[model samples]
Target chain A: ENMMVKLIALYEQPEDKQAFDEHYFNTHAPLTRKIPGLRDMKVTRIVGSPMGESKFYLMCEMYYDDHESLQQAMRTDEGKASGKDAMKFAGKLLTLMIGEEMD
Target chain B: MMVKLIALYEQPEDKQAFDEHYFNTHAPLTRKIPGLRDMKVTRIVGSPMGESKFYLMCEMYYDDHESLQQAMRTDEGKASGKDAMKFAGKLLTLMIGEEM
Candidate 1:
């Protein structure tokens, strides 16, 4: 099986942190969990910026069984809807894709 | 001082094996390489929007260029260089200079 991971660096507003965390944990997280083929998900709120320069607010990781499964998930109606909903809370987000083969 | 950052992309079909190889096999061996001070490994929680399997943040502190070179040339360092390829697939590493 192939493993594909996504690392999302989101720019979150300081003032919105509380509300965003609340809504994310309560709403967005569970909603995305229901999507098929998703292996795992994790959320991290950056406490300290690297070199004290990065204002990166949050880091989100999503893993899938394989590249194809991930692609299919995002193309689905549920994925499209949930992804759009995620943008409402963040000022900006950067996404990176990674693929892994078994060692 | 330079804040060295090393992030790795590695995941095998087996998470347990991956864990064992990193913690027991790779890390301790690398520490013997000299200037390395700390290392941390994190699992990917979701699917990629880019390419990386596992996320590792490695930090090394060097007193001088000589020490850095010494570390890289050590037996443990050479071993790690080869072992890393077995456990990991691709890598994206960055280094930054931070004020003391």
Candidate 2:
């Protein structure tokens, strides 16, 4: 079975972590589960920044059976809802998205 | 209290977009978030993953749980939370922890 993995970077205003977590845990996570074909997902809170130049508040990982399935699920009605839901909070506030894959 | 978030990503193609989005947009937003004492980020290149092409890492400092939660609810935080999907590719991994 082919597998697809996605990494999500969550950014928040450093001083206002509470709002970030509230929206992330309560708003973001539950909505993600609604997307079709997503088998698993996980969220990690930022504890510290690295030594060099890096930008991101949190990292997220999600799993799927294949790229096609993942893509299809994202375009579906439920997918649109989940996608829109995510945008409501994240759009322009901070950086987030999927990473490219390598062998 | 000191906490560090080390998020990992595996994908080079999306690097430019990710970096630009975070630097130009995301970084400022997260800095304003509550419960945050300090924060920083790093891009992992030539990592030990052997076959992986790229990776990303971020560290966040929080005073406590309250601070952490407070930061996520900001207007900026909310906006970026949803923007994450735009770059949702099918290849990446993440791990995080706090320093003792």
Candidate 3:
């Protein structure tokens, strides 16, 4: 099987964490479901870092079949809309990264 | 997975050199540590607005805190850590937290 590719958005601790979580889970996360070729989506609500406090508050792990499919999905209408919403709300607080399964 | 150890690496001076050594050497060594249930890695690609400063993200899973701690103390685990530092320490940002 091919490696499971992923797109991860790491969120910095926002001023209102609860509100951010609500918008993310209720709105943004579901929007991603409309994206074509998306295999799975999972959320990570960071509790505490090893150092006690953490700069990151949440993470959205979006999975795709492969890099090409991931790129294709992003160019789709649903993908573009999702990205619009993500960029609008999270804005600079969001740091997006992509990769694939290994080892 | 109960908890995860995340290695978020920033963009490096030599990304090509970095990834080759990581995939070829570091990741395989990391998988040998006891209590490591799973391991996966991601390469930083791009962002919606701008490019991501990060380069790679690697996740290591453990069932519980005890399991994670025990693994960290093992010789293999220490070796993995040292190996990781040798290649990734300069660009690494390590974080540990529970899975939500």
DockQ of every predicted complex: 0.11, 0.07, 0.56
Find the candidate with the highest TM-score and give its number: 3
Ranking by TM-score: 3, 1, 2
Residue-wise C-alpha lDDT for candidate 1, range A1-103, written one tens digit per residue: 3324443434434566688778777887777777777777755544443234344455555666666777788888887776777777543554444434222
Better of 1 and 2 by lDDT: 1
Q: Which one is best on lDDT?
A: 3
In candidate 3, how many Å is residue A41 off? 1.2
Model 1 / residue A61 / CA error / Å: 1.2
Which of candidates 1 and 3 reaches a greater lDDT?
Answer: 3
Tens digit of lDDT per residue, candidate 1, span B42-99?
4544434443444444444555445655666778767876787667645532332221
For every candidate, how close is chain A to the native chain A in TM-score?
Answer: 0.73, 0.72, 0.92
| Candidates in descending lDDT order | 3, 1, 2
Error of 2 at A65 (Å): 1.0
lDDT of 3 by residue, A1-103 (tens): 3467788878888887787878888999889999989988877667655547777877778888877788898999999999999888888898777766653
- Model 3: DockQ score: 0.56
Candidate 2 TM-score, true structure as reference: 0.47
| Tens-digit lDDT string for candidate 2 (A9-102) | 4555445668767877898778778877887775654444323333455656565565566567667887677667666766655444443332
- Quote each prediction's TM-score: 0.49, 0.47, 0.84
Measured by C-alpha RMSD in angstroms, how accurate is candidate 3? 2.6
Ranked candidates, highest DockQ first: 3, 1, 2
